[PDB]
Symmetry: C3
Subunit: 134 residues, 3 copies
Amino acid sequence: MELTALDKLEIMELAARFEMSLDKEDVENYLATFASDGALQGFWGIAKGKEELRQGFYAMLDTFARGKRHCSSNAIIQGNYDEATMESYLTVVNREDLNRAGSAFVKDQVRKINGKWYLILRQIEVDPSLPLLQ
Amino acid sequence: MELTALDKLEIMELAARFEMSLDKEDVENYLATFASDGALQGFWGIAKGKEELRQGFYAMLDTFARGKRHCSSNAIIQGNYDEATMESYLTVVNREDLNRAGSAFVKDQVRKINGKWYLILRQIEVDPSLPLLQ
Amino acid sequence: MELTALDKLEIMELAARFEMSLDKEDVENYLATFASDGALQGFWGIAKGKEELRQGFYAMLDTFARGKRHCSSNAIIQGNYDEATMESYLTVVNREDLNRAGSAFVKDQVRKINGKWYLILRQIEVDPSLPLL
Ligand SMILES: [K+]
């Protein structure tokens, strides 16, 4: 069967949940967005499974992700009722001052497992502006 | 019963309408997002009911909200068929120059009254970058 | 017939596709968002039809649109089953540094043609901060 409007909204909420949880430093709600064997990849490496995702969460906060607002935009989703791909943008701004922090193109593979959508693979392609890359 | 996809879209449009009406300085469209018992809360305190909401529209514009683009992102909506809660982000940029203006975490309580969604309580938790807070 | 949720989501995806194709410099995916007689209007002028839209795409990239992220937000959509209008915000930021690039108010007229939504007219009202202005 086809992807429903409710499915699309739920998949978009995975991005919103990931980003908000990261900003709040809420590791449990962050981890909930991933499948048990889900993965996060960026220039920094790959974190896969819950233990590595948990460590990765703190590592990202420590290196570049703390004290920001990470915002998702331009979601495009394609797939069916249990497997889909999302492409979107990530823009990052500082909470403590009026500067920007970076941006990225994001590609997500998502899956419906036991009736709920989860991130299988999130790939973040960071734009060259990121201070950690300069 | 559960929220429909159209419900969730309509709830997200409340945020869009609030912010666009504020930026356009369209008081009537701003107020139409609120139920008669509606309230707005932030760093500045709370305004309840349309008399207070109308005055607060001008107060906010005159001190800090004028000349901007207020953008909503990362919407997460929970609820049932006639009551829901929305969590989202607000990022604010200047229309007249290339600077940022601020950001916030936003929590909305909404209700479906005679087939249409309204804001009952909007809580804005502004980030410390807001110039006014300096 | 009223718009369905799938309709509104697809209409939103036209904006996402437009902006993502512009940023990627993917002219074929950009053009696909428009009906054959579709039009884009901005302060720079109006391009109607796919050959004008194609020329306009590269003209924009060569002058102000290259090297950015064009993000859509605050989508409001009104309509029926085959004709709608969308109002939204466009914010633009630089990919190569941490500066902003500009913003705009966007108004789109869209139409469902053979079961798929297309842009008929997109009007971009750029805010005065744009360096090109
Ligand atoms: K920005």
